[PDB]
């Protein structure tokens, strides 16, 4: 209903972050 | 024609995570 | 000097797929 | 306070690259 912000913008912000945590975690465990 | 939200932002969001569909296909597949 | 949109959100998606075109030939290149 | 651009979008922006930054050095050492 609020036009002011949609939950597009704050969950790609949200998935960047939810991304590198499972990418980071990769590269420590496996090359 | 409308300027309240360009298709970039929305496009962006949906490459997100399109491409976590791909990455995550590939871990699971191949280390 | 145009405060409608910043160029760091344009910068953002273009980055997006500019990664995903490095990245996927990667995979095509490398598993 | 300042409603007119949220540091969401802004650190958004600034992951993109960061994460670049250590996804192309880990190509670059390994493949
Ligand atoms: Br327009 C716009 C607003 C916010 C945006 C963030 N999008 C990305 C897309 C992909 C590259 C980077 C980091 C992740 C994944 C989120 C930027 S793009």
């Given at each position: ?18 991304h590198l945590?499972l990418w980071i975690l990769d590269r420590?465990?496996?090359?």
């Amino acid at each position: 209903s609020n036009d002011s912000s949609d939950p597009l913008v704050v969950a790609a912000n949200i998935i960047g972050i939810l991304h590198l945590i499972l990418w980071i975690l990769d590269r420590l465990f496996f090359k």
